Symmetry: C3
Subunit: 206 residues, 3 copies
């Protein structure tokens, strides 16, 4: 069996698609990547990650991002019964439509999940075991371990404290800002540096 | 190696069992299904799911249910030292004994977990990253993402708000009810429709 | 592809290492174990677990411990740019340095995660979906399902109630103690008994 595969034919998917993966990205043998997915350069996809673009599609992962162990990417149906695009389940980023958009230099840490409709802006850290669903996470954000964003827009440069589940726009509007002395202020840039080097080291083993 | 396997011989398992899977169910190649397990018709088991019936057994998954990416099903020992059935770890459903019972038309969303002793009634949605242990979840329920039910009985037609950890029967007795205007009121039926179609599309690829 | 593998060459890893695994330990075929890792005797590593010692290293797992389905072990870089050991990311246990130290008779239950720098003392249960990061968990502890310890030291014989996220030393200092009547007081010893027997039963299938 192959771990990089096309999505299945369904009522909302007449013409199956295979993943478009940059030659510089590293896909672990025990990761799964199915369907209408774009993976950018220098991306690392670790063991036990599941990127499944078979319901809502497409799922994009930008350059120099990382999808760590056990992370799941999936999305709600983007096409309805009559083939009507379900606009509530589609996210717009730079004039293009996605089910799930992961930007560039984004870290999806171990066991996190980003479920469409969703977008995660550049240089954001999504902490261990964190959750993003029906939300837009701006750039330069930090979701601490076990935090969650559901049904909201997290403004650029804010963080979500560990364990906090943000479900209302009033709460996301009052999230704290990332500053230099904040404990996770330098975490994402270190993580992206490490992970781009791991992708290249792992590529040299395949 | 095979991903559908018998459970190992142990002091509580003299005669090993292999999974009984309906020919219409789809088991991803990167899912694991071990031991005394019954999988019903039109069920989809996604990448990185682990259904392990080697301690507490049996584990049943009803017709038209779905076990999404990274979901785990496991259970506490159902047989003690002298071979005594441990009744506190066995759940009764329709006059039959289970370690874990997942009913029909049940969705176990990505990264959730249902650990025996446990039962989940028909047409219930168990949200992303949610947890069920030593509990009985009624039919037509909704566990929002990151909710949990531990040591309790959740009455039919109730929901558990995102992030809430329900550990006492007094709290489960006061959970809110699913109504038509509730945000997840139509989620499970849509999910089951999608997932029965995905199982058939994936079956046509194997 | 092999599921037990060496870590890749990187700027902080000139000389790659392969896992040192006791012949009595059982590594599921769908688990992943990479790099500078020591696995002790009678350890069971279940499906979908990921033990990755490629950034922070080494990762040790003591005798008669268990790494359940979907558990992740990983760690922050232990070597800086100039090759300087990053002491804040290294944990000391019995005069030896680790990125992640899991002691003996420790249970890492399904979907939990222990991220370095971290140490978990002997005879501790780390519950389902629980999280340990930049912390030291003493011996004879219990982390209930969905609890978390981040940036703290949990004293010997304490437990963390389900769902509680402990982020300050003042809070960890006031955690409750394990007593005989506590609900999870006998859980770890039962789990370790079961899991040492499962490792041996599974070893007899390979
Ligand atoms: Co989904
Ligand atoms: Co278990
Ligand atoms: Co890590």
């Amino acid at each position: 069996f192959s771990n990089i595969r096309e999505n299945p034919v369904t009522p909302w998917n007449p013409e199956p698609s295979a993943p478009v993966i940059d030659p510089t990205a590293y896909i672990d043998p025990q990761a799964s990547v199915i369907g209408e997915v774009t993976i950018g350069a220098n991306v690392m996809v670790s063991p036990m990650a599941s990127i499944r673009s078979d319901e809502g599609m497409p799922i994009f992962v930008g350059d120099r991002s990382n999808v760590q162990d056990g992370v799941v990417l999936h999305a709600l149906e983007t096409i309805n019964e009559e083939g009507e695009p379900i606009e509530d389940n589609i996210v717009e980023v730079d004039g293009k439509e996605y089910a799930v958009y992961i930007g560039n230099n984004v870290s999806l840490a171990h066991q996190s999940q980003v479920h469409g409709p969703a977008a995660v802006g550049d240089d954001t850290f999504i902490g261990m075991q964190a959750f993003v669903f029906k939300s837009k996470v701006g750039n330069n954000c930090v979701l601490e371990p076990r935090s969650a964003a559901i049904g909201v827009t997290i403004p650029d440069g804010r963080y979500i404290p560990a364990g906090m589940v943000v479900t209302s726009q009033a709460e996301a509007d009052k999230l704290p800002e990332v500053t230099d002395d904040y404990a996770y202020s330098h975490t994402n840039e270190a993580v992206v540096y490490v992970n781009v080097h791991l992708a290249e080291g792992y590529k040299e083993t395949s």
